[PDB]
Amino acid sequence: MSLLPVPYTEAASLSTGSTVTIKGRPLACFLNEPYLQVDFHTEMKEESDIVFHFQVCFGRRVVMNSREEGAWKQQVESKNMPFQDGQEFELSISVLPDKYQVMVNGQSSYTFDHRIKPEAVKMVQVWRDISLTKFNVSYLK
Amino acid sequence: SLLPVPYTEAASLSTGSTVTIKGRPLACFLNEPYLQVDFHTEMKEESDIVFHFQVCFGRRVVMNSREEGAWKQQVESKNMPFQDGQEFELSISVLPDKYQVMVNGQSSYTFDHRIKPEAVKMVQVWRDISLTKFNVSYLK
């Protein structure tokens, strides 16, 4: 119900069958290009390596990447934009054996092959131009 | 005490006006937090922008204007007086021909007027910062 702090930081343990669910709303209209960033970190430090970086420029594109040994690797870009202008969204990131599967409002929207094992993740950070009402880590089978 | 972010205030600017902002980035420079300051023509976030000032901390500064919903010619600066993990004081002064931007007492950026500063009705401060002070002052 109530708004969560942004940047939002939560310790997390991920493996095949894990899902990270986020509910939030952009802080600006799509004309002003608000951003959303979700980072799966290897340590409880914001300067640590990033196993999975998911960045939305609302109304424009999605960029996915990893930061290894302090350096950004090969960017994966998607022009798929299921997010709606001025609306609350549900972002769901599922851990599959070979990749992350990203869902937006129940629709399968993005994929990213594992570069580092998801078991290396110790923390999740959610930040940039969003208000956040829900953050949850769940596990199934 | 912190101000809400996005921060929006009604403003009237002319030659001799100064917009002072005091704040801190919400992330370390390695994570590239942003700061955006927009001088709008109306009390609407989708309205035209007389002066847009955007910092990508530790990387660059971009300045521009948005007219009839379309961005014009970008002005880029690689000058980065902002310090990693520190509080900053940003001052935007309105001169006859341009905006003069100071960072922590250092003259750092300029932007020639495209539209008269008297067209500004509102100032918006947003992106990855905590804000402790916002003030519009005049001395001329």
Side-chain angles (χ1 to χ4, degrees):
Chain A
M1 258 308 307
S2 278
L3 300 182
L4 292 178
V6 178
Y8 189 79
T9 301
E10 206 178 278
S13 289
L14 310 177
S15 50
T16 302
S18 298
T19 301
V20 176
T21 309
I22 288 142
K23 195 162 174 145
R25 194 190 192 116
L27 292 170
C29 65
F30 284 18
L31 189 68
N32 292 351
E33 300 172 84
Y35 275 79
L36 163 66
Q37 192 165 318
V38 180
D39 297 309
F40 292 1
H41 285 262
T42 58
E43 296 300 330
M44 299 305 304
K45 288 195 168 181
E46 63 165 307
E47 60 266 59
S48 76
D49 281 358
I50 301 170
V51 165
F52 180 50
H53 157 85
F54 176 84
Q55 188 194 79
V56 188
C57 176
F58 292 100
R60 287 295 284 272
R61 77 195 65 85
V62 166
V63 150
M64 290 170 291
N65 212 338
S66 64
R67 188 172 67 203
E68 308 180 36
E69 281 80 42
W72 287 103
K73 295 301 246 185
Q74 182 61 254
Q75 182 180 94
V76 168
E77 187 185 336
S78 179
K79 277 268 173 184
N80 187 25
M81 194 44 61
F83 301 97
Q84 309 280 293
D85 202 352
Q87 296 185 14
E88 267 179 72
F89 58 81
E90 186 162 291
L91 175 66
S92 186
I93 306 157
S94 291
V95 183
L96 308 185
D98 62 320
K99 64 192 158 85
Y100 292 103
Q101 203 197 355
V102 178
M103 244 116 289
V104 178
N105 302 324
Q107 179 210 297
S108 187
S109 304
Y110 317 95
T111 55
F112 187 84
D113 291 343
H114 300 307
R115 293 174 179 184
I116 299 158
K117 61 174 194 171
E119 291 84 8
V121 174
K122 281 196 186 155
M123 151 170 115
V124 179
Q125 291 199 285
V126 183
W127 64 300
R128 307 227 189 235
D129 316 295
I130 52 116
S131 61
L132 184 65
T133 48
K134 181 178 148 83
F135 183 92
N136 177 260
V137 180
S138 65
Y139 175 85
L140 182 108
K141 87 191 187 182
Chain B
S1 298
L2 302 180
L3 297 183
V5 179
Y7 185 76
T8 310
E9 184 173 301
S12 286
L13 307 181
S14 51
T15 299
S17 297
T18 301
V19 178
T20 309
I21 292 141
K22 197 173 245 171
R24 195 188 191 116
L26 293 168
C28 66
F29 284 18
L30 186 69
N31 293 347
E32 301 171 78
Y34 275 78
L35 164 65
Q36 192 164 318
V37 181
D38 298 310
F39 292 3
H40 287 259
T41 60
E42 298 298 331
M43 303 299 309
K44 290 202 274 185
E45 62 162 309
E46 59 267 61
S47 75
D48 285 351
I49 301 170
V50 165
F51 179 50
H52 157 84
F53 176 86
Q54 187 197 77
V55 188
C56 176
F57 293 100
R59 213 79 184 269
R60 75 195 67 85
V61 166
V62 149
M63 290 169 292
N64 210 338
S65 65
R66 189 174 67 202
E67 312 178 38
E68 294 299 331
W71 288 101
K72 294 217 167 171
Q73 182 61 253
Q74 180 181 96
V75 168
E76 188 184 334
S77 180
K78 278 269 172 184
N79 186 22
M80 193 48 59
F82 300 96
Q83 298 204 326
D84 201 352
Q86 301 297 300
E87 178 145 67
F88 59 79
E89 189 178 300
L90 179 68
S91 287
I92 306 156
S93 293
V94 184
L95 306 188
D97 62 321
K98 65 193 157 85
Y99 292 103
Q100 199 199 350
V101 188
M102 239 169 161
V103 180
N104 308 324
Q106 310 295 319
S107 185
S108 303
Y109 318 95
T110 54
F111 186 82
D112 292 343
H113 298 309
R114 294 173 179 183
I115 298 157
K116 61 177 193 169
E118 292 81 8
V120 174
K121 281 196 186 79
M122 173 272 264
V123 180
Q124 197 165 84
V125 182
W126 64 301
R127 307 229 189 234
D128 317 300
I129 66 137
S130 58
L131 193 61
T132 56
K133 187 179 188 177
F134 183 93
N135 178 258
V136 183
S137 70
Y138 179 82
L139 205 76
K140 213 162 197 162

